[PDB]
Amino acid sequence: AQSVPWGISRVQAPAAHNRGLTGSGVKVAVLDTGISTHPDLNIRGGASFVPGEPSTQDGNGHGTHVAGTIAALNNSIGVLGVAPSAELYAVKVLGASGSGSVSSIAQGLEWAGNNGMHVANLSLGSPSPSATLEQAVNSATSRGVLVVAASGNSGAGSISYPARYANAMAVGATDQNNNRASFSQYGAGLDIVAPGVNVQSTYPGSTYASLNGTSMATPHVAGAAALVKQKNPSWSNVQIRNHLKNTATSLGSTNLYGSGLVNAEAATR
Ligand SMILES: [Ca+2]
Ligand SMILES: [Ca+2]
């Protein structure tokens, strides 16, 4: 039987699914540790920019988990993604150890802007600014890709890079009570928040795992952008970003929660 992770229900993805919006035709690049084939995922392609890791198979589990939150298939097993029909591209920019260089991440961005991706999910970040990454974020943006990035897990009142760059949409993590997770970075530049605690998703070995992190929050917004894009095919990245924010459920202070909790039902009405 298929289970609906709590976060999926929380962002109200099933209401959009019920209206016929599943992310069909939207190409979503997952810039991460790769994505492993799995019974509950459909991977359309990708490339690897990690030296020594030429395949787009995930040696860590992180990218596979993230990819399941965005598009785990709607069928009778496993879990269910926010946009179960989005077309997932594995753009491996992080090694199996979970970290990667600015160069790898910048090359994955350029790939996503070059190969017509609509949304790029960056469930990664560092405290360190990088002009090279800013330039790649900007370039992908100018090519129509909506870059969505994790705010970071330091707990601090400022946001990690690249989420701190203007053109990256910054996503914080909430818990089951709709409270900012204690690890969730916040502050200037935070756009919105989404479920980031006890998030069950796909894991290599045709299994499922529950993880915590702004890394898990990010993909619920990347999947919600694919629903909006399906609904409004002519909107650009900026229009989508702004609509997800204008329709989020406000939770209080924008400094702590950005615009609030992403809401896929509100955003696709
Ligand atoms: Ca499933
Ligand atoms: Ca930003």
UniProtKB/Swiss-Prot annotation:
Biotechnological utility: Used as a detergent protease. Sold under the name Savinase by Novozymes.
GO cellular component: extracellular region
Cofactor remark from the record: Binds 2 calcium ions per subunit.
Disulfide bonds, paired cysteine numbers: none
Claim: Protease is one of the keywords in the record: yes
Catalyzed reactions per annotation: Hydrolysis of proteins with broad specificity for peptide bonds, and a preference for a large uncharged residue in P1. Hydrolyzes peptide amides
Subcellular location: Secreted
Primary location group: secreted
Residue sites binding Ca(2+) 2 per the record: 163, 165, 168
The enzyme's E.C. designation: 3.4.21.62
Pfam families per the UniProt record, alphabetical: Peptidase_S8 (PF00082)
Entry-linked Gene3D superfamilies: Peptidase S8/S53 domain
GO biological process, one term: proteolysis
SUPFAM superfamilies the record matches: Subtilisin-like (SSF52743)
Domain spans labelled Peptidase S8: 5-268
MF terms (GO), sorted A to Z: metal ion binding; serine-type endopeptidase activity
Keyword annotations of the record: Calcium, Hydrolase, Metal-binding, Protease, Secreted, Serine protease, Sporulation
Free-text function comment from the UniProt entry: Subtilisin is an extracellular alkaline serine protease, it catalyzes the hydrolysis of proteins and peptide amides.
Other comments on record: Secretion of subtilisin is associated with onset of sporulation, and many mutations which block sporulation at early stages affect expression levels of subtilisin. However, subtilisin is not necessary for normal sporulation.
UniProt similarity note: Belongs to the peptidase S8 family.
Protein name from the UniProt record: Subtilisin Savinase
Species assigned in the record: Lederbergia lenta
